[PDB]
Amino acid sequence: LYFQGMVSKGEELFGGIVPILVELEGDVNGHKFSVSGEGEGDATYGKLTLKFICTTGKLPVPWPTLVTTLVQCFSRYPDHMKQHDFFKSVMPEGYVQERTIFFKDDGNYKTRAEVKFEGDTLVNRIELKGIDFKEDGNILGHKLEYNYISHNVYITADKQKNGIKANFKARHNITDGSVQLADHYQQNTPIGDGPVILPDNHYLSTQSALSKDPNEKRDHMVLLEFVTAAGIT
Numbered sequence: 306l307y308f309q310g311m312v313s314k315g316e317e318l319f320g321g322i323v324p325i326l327v328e329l330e331g332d333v334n335g336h337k338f339s340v341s342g343e344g345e346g347d348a349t350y351g352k353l354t355l356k357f358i359c360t361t362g363k364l365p366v367p368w369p370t371l372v373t374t375l376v377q378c379f380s381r382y383p384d385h386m387k388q389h390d391f392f393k394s395v396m397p398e399g400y401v402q403e404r405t406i407f408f409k410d411d412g413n414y415k416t417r418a419e420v421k422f423e424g425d426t427l428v429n430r431i432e433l434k435g436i437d438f439k440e441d442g443n444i445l446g447h448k449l450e451y452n453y454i455s456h457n458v459y460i461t462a463d464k465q466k467n468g469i470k471a472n473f474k475a476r477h478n479i480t481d482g483s484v485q486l487a488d489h490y491q492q493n494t495p496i497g498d499g500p501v502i503l504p505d506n507h508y509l510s511t512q513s514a515l516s517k518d519p520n521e522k523r524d525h526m527v528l529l530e531f532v533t534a535a536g537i538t
Contacts, residue, residue: 315396319348324426333435336365351381353530367449368526382534389504397422398497409486412438450478458509468494507536
């Protein structure tokens with residue numbers, strides 16, 4: 306006699322390959338821009354394949370600084386950690402994801418996003434506001450290298466808000482060989498009133514590989530990303 310355990314509607318939605326759409330509206334120091342992204346996610350392998358296009362012409366900030374803002378529901382949670390997957394637990398109704406990202410010795414991004422299913426498609430709708438940036442600096446002056454980003458996203462339960470908090474320090478290489486710290490603070494809250502998983506402390510080991518489409522004439526970013534939950538057992 307075997308028992309499979311309860312599987313939620315949310316978890317079940319990620320069993321296969323899911324199409325993804327991303328839409329971002331941004332304003333950094335009064336520079337307005339829009340980004341659209343499309344691709345697919347395969348949570349079984351924690352695998353995301355995405356292409357983003359700046360639909361307003363030249364992106365006024367470096368692509369690498371937008372990666373984290375531009376769907377952690379696609380994380381691979383090991384079987385023994387499935388009871389700690391907040392992100393899938395709230396699907397299809399979804400979650401709000403908010404961040405402040407502090408660029409050391411420069412300005413900050415504040416972001417608000419709605420992540421939910423529209424039919425069979427996982428959608429991430431974002432507004433980004435950046436202020437206090439230097440002319441001038443590594444962000445507005447485009448002084449950041451275009452290559453990998455790899456860090457652990459540290460997650461803790463936020464019982465009082467029925468959600469989670471996360472923190473991590475992203476480190477973007479500068480073209481002079483130095484490093485630009487982007488200190489991330491994050492909160493996620495369910496959109497609906499349903500039951501949610503509040504996890505024990507853990508992290509998402511995340512690796513993003515940035516590339517270009519040789520055939521693409523618009524300002525853009527091709528992304529291959531792997532995300533795996535860890536830190537328990």
